[PDB]
Design a protein around this ligand. Sequence first.
Ligand code: HEM
Ligand code: HEM
Ligand SMILES: Cc1cc(N)nc(-c2cc(CN3CC(F)(F)C3)cc(F)c2F)c1
Ligand SMILES: Cc1cc(N)nc(-c2cc(CN3CC(F)(F)C3)cc(F)c2F)c1
Ligand SMILES: C[C@H](O)[C@H](O)[C@H]1CNc2nc(N)[nH]c(=O)c2N1
Ligand SMILES: C[C@H](O)[C@H](O)[C@H]1CNc2nc(N)[nH]c(=O)c2N1
Ligand SMILES: [Cl-]
Ligand SMILES: [Cl-]
Ligand SMILES: [Gd+3]
Ligand SMILES: [Gd+3]
Ligand SMILES: [Gd+3]
Ligand SMILES: [Zn+2]
Lengths: 401, 401
Amino acid sequence: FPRVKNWEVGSITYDTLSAQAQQDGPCTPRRCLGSLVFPAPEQLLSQARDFINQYYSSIKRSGSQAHEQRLQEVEAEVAATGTYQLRESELVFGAKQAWRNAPRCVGRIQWGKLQVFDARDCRSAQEMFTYICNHIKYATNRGNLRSAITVFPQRCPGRGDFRIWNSQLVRYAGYRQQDGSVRGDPANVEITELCIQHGWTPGNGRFDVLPLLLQAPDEPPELFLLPPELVLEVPLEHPTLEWFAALGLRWYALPAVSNMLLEIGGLEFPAAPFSGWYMSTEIGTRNLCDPHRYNILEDVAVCMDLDTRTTSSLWKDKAAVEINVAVLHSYQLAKVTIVDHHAATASFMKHLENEQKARGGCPADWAWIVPPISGSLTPVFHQEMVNYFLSPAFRYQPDPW
Amino acid sequence: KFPRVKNWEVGSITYDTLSAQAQQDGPCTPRRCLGSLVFPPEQLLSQARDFINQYYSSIKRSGSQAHEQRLQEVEAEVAATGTYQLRESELVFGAKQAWRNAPRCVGRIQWGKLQVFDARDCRSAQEMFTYICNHIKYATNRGNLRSAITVFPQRCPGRGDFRIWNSQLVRYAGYRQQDGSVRGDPANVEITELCIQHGWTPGNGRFDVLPLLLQAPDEPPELFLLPPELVLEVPLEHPTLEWFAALGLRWYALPAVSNMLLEIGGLEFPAAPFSGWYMSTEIGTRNLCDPHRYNILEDVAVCMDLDTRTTSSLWKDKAAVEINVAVLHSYQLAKVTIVDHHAATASFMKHLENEQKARGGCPADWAWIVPPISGSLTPVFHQEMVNYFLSPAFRYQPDPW
Ligand code: HEM
Ligand code: HEM
Ligand SMILES: Cc1cc(N)nc(-c2cc(CN3CC(F)(F)C3)cc(F)c2F)c1
Ligand SMILES: Cc1cc(N)nc(-c2cc(CN3CC(F)(F)C3)cc(F)c2F)c1
Ligand SMILES: C[C@H](O)[C@H](O)[C@H]1CNc2nc(N)[nH]c(=O)c2N1
Ligand SMILES: C[C@H](O)[C@H](O)[C@H]1CNc2nc(N)[nH]c(=O)c2N1
Ligand SMILES: [Cl-]
Ligand SMILES: [Cl-]
Ligand SMILES: [Gd+3]
Ligand SMILES: [Gd+3]
Ligand SMILES: [Gd+3]
Ligand SMILES: [Zn+2]
């Protein structure tokens, strides 16, 4: 079992949980590919059997009558139908486990506190839309954000998938420009074009909230505008740089990923949007300062009267820190939940400790857990980590177009 | 079987075909990635054959008279002696290759410019000291630093190694207390205790340059005072924070790693100190702000009158940036070569581009290439990378005790 050191404290642990890693990653003894962003009834049964074992362990009923009976029921259902259905309590447990198992999530100290909306009876894209609106409403909670997932019907033989075409429930449009530039968010050019192609009348601002493209089984995607009073946004200002407000920057309250596949015990839920709350570096560092995103770093630095003619003035570092200060201040001012990267990584360290006691390890992707500014100022930088895949899991999947 | 590698800032794609040549298996498997872990008779002929072939291809002389002749001589030497001697030009070529192959080095744009001092006729620790003193004076060059390596005799069976017990040629002492805590550098408490144990009168300061412990084969180490005029140091001041000087901080000019093992063509050099120049985050972020190093961050924030009562003021990030400014300002004022993390990573992207054309890829350790502050503000953050072991190489080796 891999030995793991924390270099700040000197403590050492062994990740025994990694030995149970079912599915395989991209690395080999010849080469490590850890930095890459994107690396049959019998096999359904063995996946299902392992999940049921997980579930009955969690409720202190391993080896019990109810445990063996459920294993038998699942085998019989797979034999008779090619698939099986989760019980409601199994779905809740499995959704929480998938979050808990997500190696790239620094917010997992919260994994036990997750509101699970069971939408597996959803019949249409129109009912899908209503479920999504109520997710957004519940999760936003007027700024006091609450973690939630809504689970739409599973993939099954004989029917297409439910899919949310949007990568998040709330996203800003990206309009390819006349001269080849992008107005708004360059990350969203593709989905923006698809929305227009599907009847949306575009805007022309930098922060136009996109409509939803929702796909019911064997249906074209259908366009739905979000009710604007459901989409809580935060205008960005800085506590001491009064000109910052004149940038006209905004971001939205709710980070709700909507393009990932939820896998539980072999069953696949291609539509299962989940939401928490932001860590401020996601907005202030990546979304606003990535060169291929809003790319505001140099404009802020010039307004700050920094010397942008030389790298050794650290103008980039200074401007990025104040942009992150603006995000934290603005969300706090607006009474919208947000966590800074110091508080988040501190809580993740407690999560690793909890998980070492509970499970003998914790799958974690160092390059995603360490924040994109001030890396070695946070405790996770000095913590060696073991990255591996456990199920239940959130998985990437191809775009439906 | 050729990993696809994407740069996410630009969208460009390359394939690392060089990875298909990796010799020493790394620590990762398809079941788990260990990429964040700091530390994971005549097969000598196959390693020598391969290295000789490397040398002659690099001079456009594969399959020619001198190539075959050199192949026979190493064969004859190993048959008659069980080992072989590197030609002078081969030692130079191999040192530069080991540097070029170092996956954790962001400074490899310089790999072609390296001064190699051949100390393979060395004997006794007194000779090492004069060799080390020659290196330090050459490398330091009154602040206009020049990359250099000194290669002491290779390991041979039945006889002890040449070893430098210090991890660097210049290191500050770390002294315990009437209460456990350390005055000076906590990274060097052990070698301080070893140096004192061998007769060195310790100082009482936070920045006392340690003596050298130099080990001739099968002899105990010998203490050597470094000539103080040969140890160039930089008092740290800040361009605008007038009180920063009064903190009494210093760092040394020359980063000279002296505990790693150089391996060329199957031959091993446990004493081969190499030096370049600092990247400013090494000093300003890790050495001065790591909690287990000088841990100065909060003292600087107090002096800056920052709100240390909440993490979301980003007082840590602000104090860190100003410490890095102070490092850069002070080295530039002292006319000592230094490179900031923005300049260094941009040069590394150019190195990756050069290596793509020259060799079809480049072994790179993402977690070590991305700087410890402002990670996603540097281009390497957005570059996918492949990590693997090529030879010649710098390897880690156990403490010689
Ligand atoms: C409660 C507050 C939460 C915080 C502060 C948080 C934080 C984060 C952050 C910073 C990332 C990296 C995202 C990026 O760089 O793009 C992430 C990834 C992720 N989070 Fe969490 N998260 C939270 C809640 C949740 C919840 C409720 C779930 C699921 C039930 C979840 C599942 C995931 C997954 C699957 C990823 C990986 C996404 C990917 O790699 O594409 N997170 N989280
Ligand atoms: C010339 C300017 C140079 C710069 C700016 C530079 C920069 C760096 C940096 C920042 C690191 C990370 C080390 C740490 O985090 O403590 C590193 C590692 C390393 N450097 Fe360079 N370096 C330079 C020259 C050299 C030379 C001349 C050699 C060898 C001949 C070399 C070989 C290495 C090796 C082997 C490592 C890996 C250390 C390890 O794996 O622990 N570097 N370099
Ligand atoms: C629940 C939750 C909370 C939170 N704080 N963040 C996220 C979150 C996750 C991602 C993953 N994306 C796919 C990619 F790899 F492209 C990047 C992207 C974002 F923008 C996010 F906000 C999700
Ligand atoms: C030639 C050169 C230039 C430069 N800029 N840095 C280094 C350098 C390398 C290391 C590696 N060490 C192993 C560990 F992980 F323990 C840390 C440590 C340092 F302190 C350094 F300064 C070397
Ligand atoms: C190429 C590299 O893996 C990529 O830029 C990663 C690095 N770490 C990350 N970490 C987080 N949290 N989010 C990201 O999108 C990324 N991107
Ligand atoms: C645990 C983690 O691997 C460790 O802290 C690493 C991370 N990246 C690093 N990167 C560099 N350049 N130097 C280091 O010492 C480290 N330390
Ligand atoms: Cl986002
Ligand atoms: Cl150092
Ligand atoms: Gd003002
Ligand atoms: Gd303007
Ligand atoms: Gd005062
Ligand atoms: Zn790996």
